[PDB]
């Protein structure tokens, strides 16, 4: 619901379970008033006002010095107001002139949820969603902004975008400019993050709030692999299962900043919009600029619930794909089991091999266009290499459907070899400024994807590729970060280039399968998520470490889209072994799938397969569509613990892989969660019943280890 | 020492206890290798190299995928080099591009210590400092950087300073200037900053450093009330005396950002400089600019250690006053004694009163200019009020020498109120945006010092006031924040303006005793040090709170830099009451000195200001010129106690403020530091004797309590 | 350099349920006397050790079908069982002389160089309130008495692994076995934790086999290796089962533990991690005069993409020049100690690292 009182000037929007309030105070500036649980309260009462020495006042407010936007809680602070925290909006004008000092104009209610031009964006219909858009204007910048606020009433969230239009004659540029802002007048918290690296990304770290600004963002062109565009606001002493946290979640696949400040007089203020780095943004006279959209979502009840807020939110009113609620192919991938040391003869046996196992698609990953039998050629170049595939690639999908598989193919769009055909006819296609040696990273350079003439050859390749057969499932990659940024629109339009590309693919190809990748996890994000419904999740496939991976990654992506596969040991990122059987269990918290050659494995380790693969399906709707619920933190306890909960709580598939292994072994508990405490559980493969209050409070006892990092999966059905 | 190893293009900077490395890449790339213990060790051998997903390579690396400026650690790290990292140095250049890769050109080793144009920066003599200057550039970019690497041996310090040169045709902006990095490949850490508001400066913060930045900084157009512009980076575990830890202090009065940031890698960042917000710095062909000075120094052991190095440095190598050597006037200030309700008559009252009582001088502060008799009117209109003063300031001046009192007098140069003849004059001479009402601070607005016309007509009304007789101490203050930023260059410019006007009044008047002011602390920095050897701490004059106060700014600054009043009770920015010799006591920890009528108090109150003025003419030379160590944290002890110890040991004076009070008190132990162990010390006022052994494991026993807050100072001499 | 016969060579202990207290020679098991097994071993070029475990009896025993009332009970009262076994009264001394006697039958029958004594359960049933403290001064009066009489044997306490690892013990065994894990990893903590009390020296380490009987857990021998040369060193495994390239590293490991014996025992031992919380297992041994050293690493975490780990140095002279050996590089203390050296990256799990020093 969105509410307007017009005597109060309040706008606000309720959730099921939460509240949301703002308010225009008497010299037209939009505060902040609440967020969080539900409530039909003004709740203008929480301002306060004083005179704060170097708190200065609007020249508005004449000889009031307590008012000041240095102190007060904002919808959307800026720089030019006198307020000197971290801001969401810095305007350069058309004389030079960083600010911006914004004043309530109109607003308007509409229902169903707005779309944003150019970008993803949380979608919904008119009876499961409201809009309020609220303009406000600075007459000096000549500058007009439009906050829209998105309430998805069942869901529990909020969203949040802004446009920004130049009013007057000459051009401005925009320096800065968030999609969100919470001021809090109050409150001790932590904030949690997803740090990593290539091949072990969104490792949580939690840390308390202190006086000063905690700080993450990209400038790589991208989300990144470095730290994900996603944060928790959690009060102090909130656990999984208690107390208030808030998250804000950026549906872009772009650059980003994230800050949270803790100030002079213990309040609180968190931004998450675009980086004010490589941003200068021009703005000719009449034309709107879009940032793209944040996810907001509260909980009074732990981390696990904010966290199941957004997974629900992204499968029902992000991800646009059929496969949301279909069955997926259980795929194997060439690039673990081959690299590049493969022929099209090669591909069918892995096919062959594949299909005797109960796999049901083959994806044959890089290597197959161009001259590609390495990493340093042929980006650009997405000509079916038929000497390597031994005849043409619609024989080869014929070949790979003959052995009752489906087929998928991995291509790297915007990318551009040195060494290609299409960079000696067009070296001016890859992003660089003029007179200097670029970056290069993989021996590769990026392709300006801010130029449709470069989107469209491409595309135009890529079209010819994918109509030469039933091809069921693309993987589209991307390999390095921008670097060489030549203007201050380029991050920006670079990435409506992709979006656009990507629009079109999806179009064209309604019923493909698209799995985003970026070396793993370099992109994943709810704007990919629009368009993939899942995505390669890390480079790293070794089974331990992909338990703090997957952990990190649920914090707010669900579990569908998490791309994992069982892989060949000792693993080829790590060198650790680990069993068959534990790969298996981790790799079923995701799509599921296999990345190596089955032909070098042992009888035992081929049935362990056939029977994987048939537990994953049988599993396959509840893993997807069940509650997830985090039953310990890998970083710090004995197990790695998940499980899957239906939605009327009368099965559940929990998981549990041992990381600590000692002599004379205590024994090791796992407690659930999401249960109903009356009913009574039966345990499938054991066959003794339990109630969900037991299970809840005491769990049960895991078998006792005998090898290192063994794994366990029990099943509960309701009687 | 500064020493060039050509063959492996190494430069080290030796101190009497610490080694500072640095090296030339067979790129040109200018490497960070060590800074810590004193070692005549190569340290190339830390630098590591691994193809790491996503951090690309320079051109020049070819086909070796394990070098990238992502990862390797820099002495000044710049944006344009493929690092995404934060960056010290951002340059647009002449067509918009933002980029700057430096690589090396030539160096010089100069004897002495190099000065900045028109700012404050350490200074030596030739045999006490030498100068490293690294020249590197972008062919690119037209710029050439020169970086300053001052080495003063014998306290420790490294300074840090940058210039900034177009070499090209057409104008570049400066659009972040760092002037110090740190990169440390290892390491666990804690960043400890100094946070705040008005009236309440300088707070402790202390965190570990998790993944992603913390930062702190001032857009304020000053150094500011709520960040100072300072940090220690503390190896975890480090303590008050033992452990590794890095300080950086910026030698500057304006705007700065600092950030620590713990990266993918587990390798730590630490940059401190120019604030990158309202900062677009013209450069014209062949002009330069000065970043100004940073201040670096290490502890092997502890926090104390790094302080003292500090104070040391601060005093001897920043401070140019000679009442650095020299006994200060014990002075009584008419603030909080009169506000702005005071005549001829008052001032000459409280002469006469602080006359009889031993104070030396007699401050008028705010209200004798102008029609100054609120703070509603007048900043601009330095002329002299002598219907207020009843007569003129000469006259006023006669007589309170009369009295056997110096005098001194308050200035608020830089600013200007709407209700002044000035403004009715020159409103165009305030700091605005043309078409927008500018913010209202304490209903001023600051002028623009940018503008030599400006400038220079208040400096000769500053002139003709103190021209008027022998006056010796100004109070120069400062009482908002700067808003209305009109252009990019202004922040910077701004500040060059005040140092100017400082510099010539200091030239001009150089017997001065000048004390600086902002609201307080609002600009606690060594650049204003350089001019004024004291800066009013705090308006927050409560002893309890400026226990908190003189403890937090201790960290970096020396006590004689603080000043420090006795004021009335109850207190007038509290409520809370203090017995007047906590009072006495808590300010003995500064300049010393009193803000209240003395006619109000008690015969026996009066007798306290007789005693307290002998204790601290008595200590002065101690309190002013020792060693000063933190006995204890006011934010978690029972107590708050310090001490200074003479250069030779030989004399100690130790200062306890209790700050809880329970019955049935357990016994409270201070521990002293800073002694010789095998030493014998008499206690004088209870002539007990104890070795320095005792005193500093065992510590004393306070005396028992009778009432709260109660304050005690101890005085060991070497028998 | 020798073979120590463990527990199963007395009465008829074939397993651990019955026969301690009956420390009489099993000469069928031995296929003949124990003199003649010594002097068979010794023609092999190796020294003999034996395993005893004299505070205790089985039911199953002749000592105890004789003299049922010699286990610690309180009469009328079923005792307590642990490892199927009772303690016998060492407070009484005709219980302890019967016992004494029996030893020194065997260790009289030829060249023992070493004894094991072990100790396999509790006391309880405690009858009275002095028998704790007396049943004690019976054993190391026992103990005195087998010292005395035995003057050049190695004597290694044992008591389930480490349960009497304590300076009372030390007064008469110079080693102590530390623990029955034997797994490398796992090791890493018992002997940190080990260490703040007690010297490297005193702890029995040994390397064993794979998967560890203990855990289950793989290593590879040379992390074996590193982590059981923190202490005394040895094997307990059948090296006949071993690849040819394993019996290699334990030539090579003999050859490194004997040129670092000294210095490992009488160096000053240096803590350089916490194998809690750190990704290393880190320590290092210093001569007394500062002018050598060997460290030892063993890796407890992987990831990949790894980041480079530093070990830092402890406990060298700042400003002397110390030689690595394999890699020859030159180094001063201080940057040994302030910046350390980094680790070469990990290829596998569980990697373990040595580098020694020579001051220059
Ligand atoms: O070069 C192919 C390779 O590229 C990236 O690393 C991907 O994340 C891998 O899964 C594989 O597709
Ligand atoms: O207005 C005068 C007043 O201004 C600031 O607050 C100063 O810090 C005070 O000490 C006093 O000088
Ligand atoms: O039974 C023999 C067995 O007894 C205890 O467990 C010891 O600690 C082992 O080393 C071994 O001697
Ligand atoms: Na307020
Ligand atoms: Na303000
Ligand atoms: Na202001
Ligand atoms: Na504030
Ligand atoms: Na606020
Ligand atoms: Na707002
Ligand atoms: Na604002
Ligand atoms: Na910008
Ligand atoms: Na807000
Ligand atoms: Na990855
Ligand atoms: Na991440
Ligand atoms: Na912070
Ligand atoms: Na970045
Ligand atoms: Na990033
Ligand atoms: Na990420
Ligand atoms: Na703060
Ligand atoms: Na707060
Ligand atoms: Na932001
Ligand atoms: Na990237
Ligand atoms: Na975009
Ligand atoms: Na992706
Ligand atoms: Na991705
Ligand atoms: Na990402
Ligand atoms: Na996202
Ligand atoms: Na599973
Ligand atoms: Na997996
Ligand atoms: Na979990
Ligand atoms: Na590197
Ligand atoms: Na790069
Ligand atoms: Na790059
Ligand atoms: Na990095
Ligand atoms: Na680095
Ligand atoms: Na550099
Ligand atoms: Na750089
Ligand atoms: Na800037
Ligand atoms: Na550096
Ligand atoms: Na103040
Ligand atoms: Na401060
Ligand atoms: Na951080
Ligand atoms: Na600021
Ligand atoms: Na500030
Ligand atoms: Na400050
Ligand atoms: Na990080
Ligand atoms: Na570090
Ligand atoms: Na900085
Ligand atoms: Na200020
Ligand atoms: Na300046
Ligand atoms: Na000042
Ligand atoms: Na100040
Ligand atoms: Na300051
Ligand atoms: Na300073
Ligand atoms: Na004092
Ligand atoms: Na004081
Ligand atoms: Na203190
Ligand atoms: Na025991
Ligand atoms: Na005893
Ligand atoms: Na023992
Ligand atoms: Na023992
Ligand atoms: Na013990
Ligand atoms: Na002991
Ligand atoms: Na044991
Ligand atoms: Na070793
Ligand atoms: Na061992
Ligand atoms: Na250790």
């Given at each position: 619901a969105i509410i307007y009182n017009p005597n109060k000037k309040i706008f606000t929007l309720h959730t099921a379970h939460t509240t949301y309030q703002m308010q225009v105070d008497p010299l037209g500036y939009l505060l902040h008033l609440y967020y969080g649980?539900?409530?039909?309260?003004?709740?203008?009462?929480?301002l306060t006002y004083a005179d704060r020495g170097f708190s200065g006042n609007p020249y508005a407010a004449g000889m009031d010095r307590t008012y000041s936007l240095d102190a007060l809680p904002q919808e959307y602070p800026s720089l030019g107001t006198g307020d000197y925290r971290n801001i969401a909006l810095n305007i350069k004008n058309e004389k030079g002139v960083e600010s911006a000092d914004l004043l309530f104009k109109s607003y308007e209610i509409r229902n169903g949820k707005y779309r944003l031009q150019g970008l993803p964006a949380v979608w919904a219909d008119e009876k499961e969603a409201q809009t309020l858009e609220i303009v406000l204007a600075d007459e000096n910048a000549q500058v007009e902004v439009h906050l829209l606020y998105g309430v998805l009433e069942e869901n529990d969230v909020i969203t949040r975008s802004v446009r920004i239009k130049n009013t007057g004659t000459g051009q401005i540029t925009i320096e800065k400019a968030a999609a969100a802002c919470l001021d809090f007048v109050q409150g001790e918290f932590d904030v949690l993050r997803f740090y990593g690296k290539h091949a072990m990304e969104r490792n949580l770290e939690r840390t308390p709030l202190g006086h000063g600004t905690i700080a993450f963002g990209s400038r790589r062109g991208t989300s990144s692999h470095q730290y994900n565009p996603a944060v928790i606001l959690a009060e102090k002493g909130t656990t999984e299962t208690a107390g208030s946290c808030y998250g804000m979640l950026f549906v872009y696949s772009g650059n980003f900043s994230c800050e949270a400040e803790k100030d002079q007089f213990n309040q609180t203020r968190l931004l998450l919009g675009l980086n004010e780095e490589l941003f200068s943004y021009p703005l000719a006279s009449g034309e709107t600029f879009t940032v793209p959209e944040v996810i907001l979502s509260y909980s009074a009840e732990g981390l696990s619930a904010l966290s199941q807020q957004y997974h629900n939110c992204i499968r029902n009113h992000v991800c646009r794909s059929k496969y949301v609620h279909m069955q997926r192919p259980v795929l194997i991938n060439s690039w673990e089991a081959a690299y590049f040391d493969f022929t099209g003869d090669t591909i069918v046996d892995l096919a062959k091999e594949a299909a005797s196992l109960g796999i049901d698609m083959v994806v044959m990953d890089?290597?197959?266009?161009?001259?590609?039998?390495?990493?340093?050629?042929?980006?650009?170049?997405?000509?079916?290499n038929e000497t390597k595939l031994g005849g043409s690639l619609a024989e080869l999908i014929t070949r790979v459907h003959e052995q009752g598989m489906k087929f998928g193919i991995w291509i790297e769009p915007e990318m551009i070899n040195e060494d290609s055909d299409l960079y000696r006819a067009h070296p001016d296609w890859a992003i660089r400024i003029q007179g200097k040696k670029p970056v290069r990273s993989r021996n590769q350079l990026l392709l300006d994807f801010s130029r449709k003439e470069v989107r469209d050859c491409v595309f135009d390749q890529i079209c010819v590729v994918l109509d030469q057969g039933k091809i069921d499932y693309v993987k589209w990659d991307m390999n390095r970060s921008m670097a060489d940024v030549y203007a201050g629109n380029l991050s920006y339009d670079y990435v409506l280039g992709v979006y656009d590309f990507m629009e079109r693919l999806c179009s064209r190809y309604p019923d493909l399968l698209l799995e985003g990748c970026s070396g793993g996890g370099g992109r994943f994000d709810a704007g990919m998520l629009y368009y993939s419904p899942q995505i390669w999740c890390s480079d790293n496939t070794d089974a331990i470490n992909r338990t703090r991976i997957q952990y990190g990654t649920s914090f707010f992506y669900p579990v569908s889209a998490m791309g994992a596969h069982v892989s060949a040991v000792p693993n080829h990122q790590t060198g650790r072994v680990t069993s068959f059987h534990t790969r298996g269990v981790t790799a079923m918290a995701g799509t599921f799938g296999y990345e190596l050659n089955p032909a070098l494995l042992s009888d035992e380790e081929k049935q362990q397969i056939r029977e994987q693969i048939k537990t994953y399906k049988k599993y396959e709707t509840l893993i997807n569509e069940g509650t997830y619920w985090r039953l310990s933190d890998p970083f710090t306890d004995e197990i790695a613990a998940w499980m899957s909960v239906s939605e009327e709580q009368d099965h559940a598939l929990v998981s549990v892989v041992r990381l600590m292994a000692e002599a004379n072994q205590a024994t090791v508990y796992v407690r659930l969660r999401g249960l109903k405490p009356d009913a009574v559980y039966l345990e499938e493969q054991s066959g003794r019943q339990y109630s969900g209050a037991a299970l809840m409070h005491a769990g049960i006892p895991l078998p006792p280890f005998t090898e290192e990092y063994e794994a366990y999966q029990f099943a509960f059905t309701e009687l």
């Amino acid at each position: 619901a969105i509410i307007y009182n017009p005597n109060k000037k309040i706008f606000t929007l309720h959730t099921a379970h939460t509240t949301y309030q703002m308010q225009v105070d008497p010299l037209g500036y939009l505060l902040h008033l609440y967020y969080g649980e539900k409530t039909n309260s003004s709740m203008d009462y929480v301002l306060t006002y004083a005179d704060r020495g170097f708190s200065g006042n609007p020249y508005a407010a004449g000889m009031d010095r307590t008012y000041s936007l240095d102190a007060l809680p904002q919808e959307y602070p800026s720089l030019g107001t006198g307020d000197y925290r971290n801001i969401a909006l810095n305007i350069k004008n058309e004389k030079g002139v960083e600010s911006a000092d914004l004043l309530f104009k109109s607003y308007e209610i509409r229902n169903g949820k707005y779309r944003l031009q150019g970008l993803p964006a949380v979608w919904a219909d008119e009876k499961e969603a409201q809009t309020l858009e609220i303009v406000l204007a600075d007459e000096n910048a000549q500058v007009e902004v439009h906050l829209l606020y998105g309430v998805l009433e069942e869901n529990d969230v909020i969203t949040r975008s802004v446009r920004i239009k130049n009013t007057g004659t000459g051009q401005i540029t925009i320096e800065k400019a968030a999609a969100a802002c919470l001021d809090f007048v109050q409150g001790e918290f932590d904030v949690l993050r997803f740090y990593g690296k290539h091949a072990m990304e969104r490792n949580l770290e939690r840390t308390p709030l202190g006086h000063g600004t905690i700080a993450f963002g990209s400038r790589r062109g991208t989300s990144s692999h470095q730290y994900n565009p996603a944060v928790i606001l959690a009060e102090k002493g909130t656990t999984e299962t208690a107390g208030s946290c808030y998250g804000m979640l950026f549906v872009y696949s772009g650059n980003f900043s994230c800050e949270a400040e803790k100030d002079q007089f213990n309040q609180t203020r968190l931004l998450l919009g675009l980086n004010e780095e490589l941003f200068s943004y021009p703005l000719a006279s009449g034309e709107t600029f879009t940032v793209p959209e944040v996810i907001l979502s509260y909980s009074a009840e732990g981390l696990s619930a904010l966290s199941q807020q957004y997974h629900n939110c992204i499968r029902n009113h992000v991800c646009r794909s059929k496969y949301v609620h279909m069955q997926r192919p259980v795929l194997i991938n060439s690039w673990e089991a081959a690299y590049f040391d493969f022929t099209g003869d090669t591909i069918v046996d892995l096919a062959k091999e594949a299909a005797s196992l109960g796999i049901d698609m083959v994806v044959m990953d890089d290597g197959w266009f161009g001259k590609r039998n390495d990493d340093n050629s042929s980006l650009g170049d997405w000509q079916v290499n038929e000497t390597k595939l031994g005849g043409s690639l619609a024989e080869l999908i014929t070949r790979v459907h003959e052995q009752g598989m489906k087929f998928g193919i991995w291509i790297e769009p915007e990318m551009i070899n040195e060494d290609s055909d299409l960079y000696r006819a067009h070296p001016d296609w890859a992003i660089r400024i003029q007179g200097k040696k670029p970056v290069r990273s993989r021996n590769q350079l990026l392709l300006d994807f801010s130029r449709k003439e470069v989107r469209d050859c491409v595309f135009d390749q890529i079209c010819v590729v994918l109509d030469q057969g039933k091809i069921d499932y693309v993987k589209w990659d991307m390999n390095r970060s921008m670097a060489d940024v030549y203007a201050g629109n380029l991050s920006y339009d670079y990435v409506l280039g992709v979006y656009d590309f990507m629009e079109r693919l999806c179009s064209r190809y309604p019923d493909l399968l698209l799995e985003g990748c970026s070396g793993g996890g370099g992109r994943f994000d709810a704007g990919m998520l629009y368009y993939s419904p899942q995505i390669w999740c890390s480079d790293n496939t070794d089974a331990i470490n992909r338990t703090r991976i997957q952990y990190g990654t649920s914090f707010f992506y669900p579990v569908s889209a998490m791309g994992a596969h069982v892989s060949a040991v000792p693993n080829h990122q790590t060198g650790r072994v680990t069993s068959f059987h534990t790969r298996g269990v981790t790799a079923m918290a995701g799509t599921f799938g296999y990345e190596l050659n089955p032909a070098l494995l042992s009888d035992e380790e081929k049935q362990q397969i056939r029977e994987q693969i048939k537990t994953y399906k049988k599993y396959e709707t509840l893993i997807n569509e069940g509650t997830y619920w985090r039953l310990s933190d890998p970083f710090t306890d004995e197990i790695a613990a998940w499980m899957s909960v239906s939605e009327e709580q009368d099965h559940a598939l929990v998981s549990v892989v041992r990381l600590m292994a000692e002599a004379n072994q205590a024994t090791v508990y796992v407690r659930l969660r999401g249960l109903k405490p009356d009913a009574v559980y039966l345990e499938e493969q054991s066959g003794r019943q339990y109630s969900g209050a037991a299970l809840m409070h005491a769990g049960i006892p895991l078998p006792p280890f005998t090898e290192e990092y063994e794994a366990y999966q029990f099943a509960f059905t309701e009687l």
